[PDB]
A paper describes a structure:
In well-characterized T4SSs, VirB7 is a lipoprotein attached to the periplasmic side of the outer membrane. In order to understand the unique structural features of Xanthomonad VirB7, we have solved the solution nuclear magnetic resonance (NMR) and X-ray crystal structures of XAC2622, which we now call VirB7XAC2622, and studied its interaction with VirB9. VirB7XAC2622 presents all of the characteristics of VirB7: predicted signal peptide and lipobox sequences followed by a short and extended region that contains the VirB9 binding site. However, unlike other VirB7 proteins, VirB7XAC2622 has an extra domain whose topology is strikingly similar to that of N0 domains found in proteins from different multi-subunit complexes involved in transport across the bacterial outer membrane.
To better characterize the globular domain, we cloned and purified a recombinant fragment encompassing residues 51–134 (VirB7XAC2622_51–134) which was submitted to crystallization trials that resulted in large plates which belong to space group C2221 and diffracted up to 1.0 Å. Molecular replacement was performed using the solution structure of the VirB7XAC2622 globular domain as the search model. There was clear electron density for all residues, with the exception of the first amino acid (threonine 51) and residues 122 and 123 in the loop between β4 and β5. As expected, the crystal structure is very similar to the NMR ensemble, displaying an average root mean square deviation (RMSD) for the backbone heavy atoms and all heavy atoms of 1.05±0.05 Å and 1.61±0.06 Å for residues 53–130, and excellent agreement with the backbone 1H-15N RDCs [Q factor of 0.187 (regular secondary structures only) and 0.272 (all residues)]. The globular domain is composed of two α-helices sandwiched between a mixed three stranded β-sheet on one side and an antiparallel two-stranded β-sheet plus a short 310 helix on the other. The VirB7XAC2622 globular domain has no significant sequence similarity to proteins of known structure. In addition to the canonical VirB7-like N-terminal region, VirB7XAC2622 has a C-terminal region that includes a globular domain (residues 52–133). This globular domain does not interact with VirB9XAC2620_154–255 but does interact with an extended region (residues 42–49) that immediately precedes the globular domain in another VirB7XAC2622 molecule, leading to the formation of homo-oligomers. As expected, no cross-links were observed when the experiment was performed using VirB7XAC2622_51–134 which lacks the disordered N-terminal region.
Author numbering: 51 to 134
Amino acid sequence: TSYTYQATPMDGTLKTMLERWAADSNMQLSYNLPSDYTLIGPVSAISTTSVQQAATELSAVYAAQGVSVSVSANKLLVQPVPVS
C-alpha cells in the first residue's frame, strides 16, 4: 504494498515533498516558515503508511531547526514549534 509516506526521487525539498504528501492525501499544506529547506539524509528513513507517524518522524528531523510538522485536520502544518 500500500501507499507509503516517504521521500522519493521526485522530492528535493521539505515543502515540495509535503506538497506531494498533501496532494496524495486530499490534504492542505500550511507551510508557515520563511524558507524552504532541502531534505536532509535522515528523511530517507521515513517509510510508513501512517501519516501521523510520517509527519511526526519528519517533525523530529527538523526539530533542531526549530520546526514542528503535524497533522491538523485536513492539513499538514509546518510551523515554528509552539511552546508554553
